[PDB]
């Protein structure tokens, strides 16, 4: 029987957005990949005040947020016939205007909150730092290395929600040849990525990757190496990088269009103002070090710089994506035609176009590079090749069972000077590479 | 070429809820894991009579089922304005009240019907019974041992339905930068778990698990062991454990609320009375025996006693779950606002709140123990550890490719006196464990 013993930092009082040095000096004859606990805190936002019917206050990210007057369009200049505006809670509850402390912004964690935490890690022993890496290398490893079976539980370690399915009871159906009972299936999930008023404290169990900590026989001896000089440095993530604000207030619009079929259209538009986010502490953050008793196939990934840049409105869920993405919006309406006079009965006397408050956003990913050309001086390597070959067929036929087929066109496999022949040129291309595998 | 030969029981006339002794005396020089066929029968329920508008008959599980009068709430005491009640078939068809033989209760099999069949099995040869096991250890093995790839077909052996997907044709969408055609995907399924009026006869192909029947080289010789004294005992499940009743009658309630927007709300509530279920036989129940011609990592699971207890309303689909669960309900409505007078056009003249007959139930699972402490006398083992470590990281890093990552927080992995530090204390905790793996 073997037991893993913990260790505490010596610097003390960990803070977000600052460098932390941990000893891990000498505990264990042999050591392998470490585990770091991190217990987060509450994430309630600051109280805000409802706007006035004429307000046109400046918003965030350079986008103006307006509260239109009655009888106007979203802008306060062009007159629109039969437009009435009201304030509503994202859940549909009314919100009274002009009242102090009327609503609170929702707070939601960025996708994979535990992955952006280690933006930079250094493994060093009295200078001459042995190992460097960051978040992009971890993402590239995640998309390829870990098997698809060992996934769901791994999604719980980094604070990512997982989906659960429910049913809807029996339903009657017709069967065509040349009646039955069937059941419907729905998928839904909740967790850190779901915007909530008050976030339960998270528990990140972050895993550390190393070249010599993948096999028990590859561990370096502790006696030979200097035990007292080992000092692992970690750059904690910025407080503004993990959490984010979702609008806690909506400007409902109602319309009325004349003609033989009266049409009542209802639309929504968020009122987003960046408030103040409560400080989030990192308590009980020990590293449960696991202590026991006794050229090749190459990965690359291409990412637009806009994915990491703060100017991206959806930077919290596009940072890990390889390849520029677009948003597809499906707005579903609830039509209903009614007739009152039961004489002419030709066209609906009245109609309705009720629409949901929040749309359905699909992050469609598209290839960024039309062609690849890796022309090194020593070896010609690959030139004028399509992206689909290195994206799909190479992992399919090479790698074996450990490798998992890529899902995004940005990253690819080639079995250093690298060039591109893309058309979406904006000097935003950034490359990440792994060769030790 | 090798062919497997069958064998029939010697007791004869198998019955549900009684012990059956099967020979398997001597057929086969070497034998491995057995297979048992079981063909079930019809499951039509008994005819019942529609209630009267004032009836308040006693229901099942101690819950009163009422048919409220006009102008009252669900209870027959508090007056409610504008409430009208009617009887409806779960599929929406009207049901006339006070008519003899007016409806039939729906009959549906419990989740994994073939897994509860073998509530207890004994492997013995002239006394000194060699092997004992039951359903819970098989559930644990299913949740951990069998790979995720070998799943769908295995889901057909134990009579569990599998989902199928359909499409909805082209739809027009918008793409935002800095129009397209897309298709929607829906999932639905039918089978034994779907409540149906008449259940086709099932076909269970149940598999038997053993320590020495996992490898061909580990099979004990038949000549050395006593062939004539082998007698395998199986305790078949009770007839009330597999099948269950779903309400075949619903009490539709309609309302009307005065005001500027005149709403019309429709709600439903089941009328559930436990009828008589037709006897289900076990015919053609041969065992197609497979006959051919010639400390460590430990798995534990924690389950509330309410999961198995008959007092649980959803015991048929919670028995295999590890960890207490709750039910989340999304009731979807169909709003539609209409205006008649086209001269005010500010507040909707009328509204509708049509609701579905059956809600969408999500079985949300929650951890039962906030801490674990396994303190044995000989070895301290583990003490004061979080459940997330033994639930997620240990299977992720230990086990290899054979193990599958757990989905439920109740079960965990630890590489016998076991203690717990839970807060949901009700003397309902039950532990299952396996160590031979």
């Amino acid at each position, epitope marked *: 029987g073997f037991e893993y013993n913990k260790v505490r930092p010596h610097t003390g009082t960990p803070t977000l957005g600052n460098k932390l040095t941990f000893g891990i000096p000498q505990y264990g004859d042999f050591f392998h990949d470490m585990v770091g606990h991190h217990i987060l805190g509450a994430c309630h936002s600051s109280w805000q005040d409802a706007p006035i019917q004429g307000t046109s206050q400046m918003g965030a990210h350079g986008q103006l947020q307006t509260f239109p007057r*009655n009888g106007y369009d979203w802008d306060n200049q062009t007159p629109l016939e039969g437009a009435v505006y009201t304030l509503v809670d994202p859940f549909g509850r009314p919100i009274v205007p002009g009242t102090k402390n009327a609503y609170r912004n929702l707070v939601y964690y960025c996708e994979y909150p535990g992955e952006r935490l280690y933006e930079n890690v250094r493994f060093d022993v009295n200078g001459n730092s042995l190992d460097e890496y960051s978040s992009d290398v971890t993402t590239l490893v995640r998309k390829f290395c870990i098997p698809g079976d060992k996934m769901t539980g791994y999604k719980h370690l980094v604070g990512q929600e997982v989906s659960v399915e429910g049913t809807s009871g029996p339903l009657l159906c017709n069967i065509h040849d040349l009646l039955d009972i069937r059941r419907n299936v729905h998928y839904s999930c909740n967790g850190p990525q779901t915007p909530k008023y008050y976030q339960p404290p998270l528990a990140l169990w972050i895993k550390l990757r190393f070249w010599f900590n993948e096999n028990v026989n590859l561990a370096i001896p502790s006696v030979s190496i200097p035990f007292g000089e080992r000092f692992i440095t970690i750059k904690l993530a910025s407080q503004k990088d993990l959490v984010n604000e979702f609008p806690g207030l909506f400007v409902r619009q109602s319309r009325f269009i004349a003609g033989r079929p009266s049409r009542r259209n209802i639309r929504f538009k968020p009122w987003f103002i960046p408030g103040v986010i409560n400080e989030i502490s990192l308590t009980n953050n020990e590293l449960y070090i696991n202590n026991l008793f006794v050229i090749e196939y190459m990965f690359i990934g291409l990412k637009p710089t806009w994915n990491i840049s703060d100017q991206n409105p959806h930077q919290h869920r596009d940072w890990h994506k390889f390849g520029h993405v677009v948003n597809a919006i499906m707005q579903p309406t609830h039509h209903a035609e009614i007739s009152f006079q039961d004489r002419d009965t030709a066209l609906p006397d009245a109609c309705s176009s009720i629409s949901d408050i929040s749309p359905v956003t699909y992050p469609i990913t598209l290839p960024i590079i039309k062609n690849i050309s890796v022309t090194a001086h020593g070896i010609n390597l690959i030139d004028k090749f399509p992206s689909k070959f290195c994206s799909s067929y190479i992992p399919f036929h090479y790698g074996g069972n450990a490798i998992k087929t890529p899902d995004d066109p940005g990253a690819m496999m080639i079995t250093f000077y690298i060039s591109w022949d893309t058309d979406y040129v904006g000097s935003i291309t950034t490359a990440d590479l792994v060769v030790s595998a | 070429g090798f062919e497997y030969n069958k064998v029939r029981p010697h007791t004869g006339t198998p019955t549900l809820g009684n012990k059956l002794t099967f020979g398997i005396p001597q057929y086969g020089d070497f034998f491995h894991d057995m297979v048992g066929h079981h063909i079930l029968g019809a499951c039509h329920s008994s005819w019942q009579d529609a209630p009267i508008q004032g009836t308040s008959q006693m229901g099942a599980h101690g819950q009163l089922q009422t048919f409220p009068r006009n102008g009252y709430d669900w209870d027959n005491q508090t007056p409610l304005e504008g409430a009208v009640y009617t009887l409806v078939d779960p599929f929406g068809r009207p049901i006339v009240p006070g008519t003899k033989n007016a409806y039939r209760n729906l009959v549906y099999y419990c989740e994994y019907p073939g897994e509860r069949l073998y509530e207890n099995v004994r492997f013995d040869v002239n006394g000194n019974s060699l092997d004992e096991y039951s359903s819970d250890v098989t559930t644990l093995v299913r949740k951990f041992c069998i790979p995720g790839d070998k799943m769908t077909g295995y889901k057909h052996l134990v009579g569990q339905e599998v989902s199928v997907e359909g499409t909805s044709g082209p739809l027009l969408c918008n793409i935002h930068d800095l129009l397209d055609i897309r298709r929607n995907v829906h999932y639905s399924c039918n089978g034994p778990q779907t409540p149906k009026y008449y259940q086709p006869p099932l076909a269970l192909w149940i598999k038997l698990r053993f320590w020495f029947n996992e490898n061909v080289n580990l099979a004990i010789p038949s000549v050395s062991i006593p062939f004539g004294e082998r007698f395998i005992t199986i305790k078949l499940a009770s007839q009330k454990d597999l099948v269950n009743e779903f309400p075949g009658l619903f009490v539709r309630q309609s309302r009307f609320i005065a005001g500027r927007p005149s709403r019309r709300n429709i709600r439903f509530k089941p009328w559930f009375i436990p009828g008589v279920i037709n006897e289900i036989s076990l015919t053609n129940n041969e065992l197609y025996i497979n006959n051919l011609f010639v400390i460590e990592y430990m798995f534990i699971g924690l389950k509330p006693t309410w999961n198995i207890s008959d007092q649980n309303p959803h015991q048929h689909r919670d028995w295999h779950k590890f960890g207490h669960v709750v039910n989340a309900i999304m009731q979807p409505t169909h709003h539609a606002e209409i205006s008649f007078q086209d*001269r*005010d056009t500010a507040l909707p003249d009328a509204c509708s709140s049509i609701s579905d007959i059956s809600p969408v139930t999500y079985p949300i699972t929650l951890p039962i123990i906030k801490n674990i402490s396994v303190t044995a006398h000989g070895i301290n083992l583990i003490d004061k550890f979080p459940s997330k470590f033994c639930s997620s990281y240990i299977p992720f890093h230990y086990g290899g490719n054979a193990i599958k990552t757990p989905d439920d927080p109740g079960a965990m992995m630890i590489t016998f006196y076991i203690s717990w530090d839970t807060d949901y204390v009700g003397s309902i905790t039950t532990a299952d464990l396996v160590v031979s793996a």
Partner: antibody, heavy 122, light 108 residues
Framework: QEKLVESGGGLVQPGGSLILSCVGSGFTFITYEINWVRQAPGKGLEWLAV????????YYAHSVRGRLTISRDNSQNTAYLQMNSLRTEDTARYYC?????????????????WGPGVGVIV | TVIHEPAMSLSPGGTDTLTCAFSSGSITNNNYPSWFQQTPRQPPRLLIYNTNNRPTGVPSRFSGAISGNKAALTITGAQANDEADYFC??????????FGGGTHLTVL
């Protein structure tokens, strides 16, 4: 600089017939309604009639219906109001006004750009 | 009918309030209060067409809301050019518009 001008007001014997003409400039008269508001001396203001955008529909008040005939002329952008069966109470100030359609549409809600008004006496 | 003040006075640079009320009932958003102004021998100018909305070109020193079941118009930082009249109008029934009396506001 949109302008509205009323004409046709003056001294008149009771029981006669009167025509009030409202003309506009600086704005598109096609896509706007025309309302007429009467203000009695030493009293409040009252609403009189409504004419639609293209004259298809019209409405009136309870105490003046049957004697008032509102009409439009979109050629040279002029609205007419014929009034008959004159009595002494008609002494007031009449204002031809424009209107948008927010919330309520036909009776008018916003009522931008009131005219100077014309005084009519018996 | 609509009840409104007969007369009202204000000192220069002060704050003034005006109230518009019903005979029997209360006042809510559905009534649609509207506040105008009428200087002598000039056309009336729209000030507050809904409860709190105002058109373009009107100085931002005007306000208005519903308080105490009345329509309230508040003027802050009034100048000496407000020697005019103020009246209230409301919307009842389905197509009924009722105007109110006028206040000859005076600045000392």
């Amino acid at each position: 600089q949109e302008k509205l001008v009323e004409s046709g007001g003056g001294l008149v014997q009771p029981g006669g017939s009167l025509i009030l003409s409202c003309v506009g400039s600086g704005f598109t008269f096609i896509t706007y309604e025309i309302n007429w508001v009467r203000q009695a001396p030493g009293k409040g203001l009252e609403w009189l009639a409504v004419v639609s955008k293209i004259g298809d529909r019209t409405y009136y008040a309870h105490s003046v219906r049957g004697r008032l005939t509102i009409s439009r002329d979109n050629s040279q952008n002029t609205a007419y109001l014929q009034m008959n069966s004159l009595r002494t109470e008609d002494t007031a100030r009449y204002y031809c006004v424009r209107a948008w359609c927010a919330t309520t549409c036909l009776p008018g809600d916003i009522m931008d750009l009131w005219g100077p008004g014309v005084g009519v006496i018996v | 009918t609509v009840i409104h003040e007969p007369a009202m006075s204000l000192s220069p640079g002060g704050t003034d309030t005006l109230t518009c009320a019903f005979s029997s009932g209360s006042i809510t958003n559905n009534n649609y209060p509207s506040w105008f102004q009428q200087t002598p021998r000039q056309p009336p100018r729209l000030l507050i067409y809904n409860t709190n909305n105002r058109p373009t070109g009107v100085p931002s020193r005007f306000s208005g809301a519903i308080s105490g079941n009345k329509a309230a118009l508040t003027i802050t930082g009034a100048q000496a050019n407000d020697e005019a009249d103020y009246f209230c109008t409301l919307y009842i029934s389905i197509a009924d518009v009722i105007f109110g009396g006028g206040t000859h506001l005076t600045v000392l």
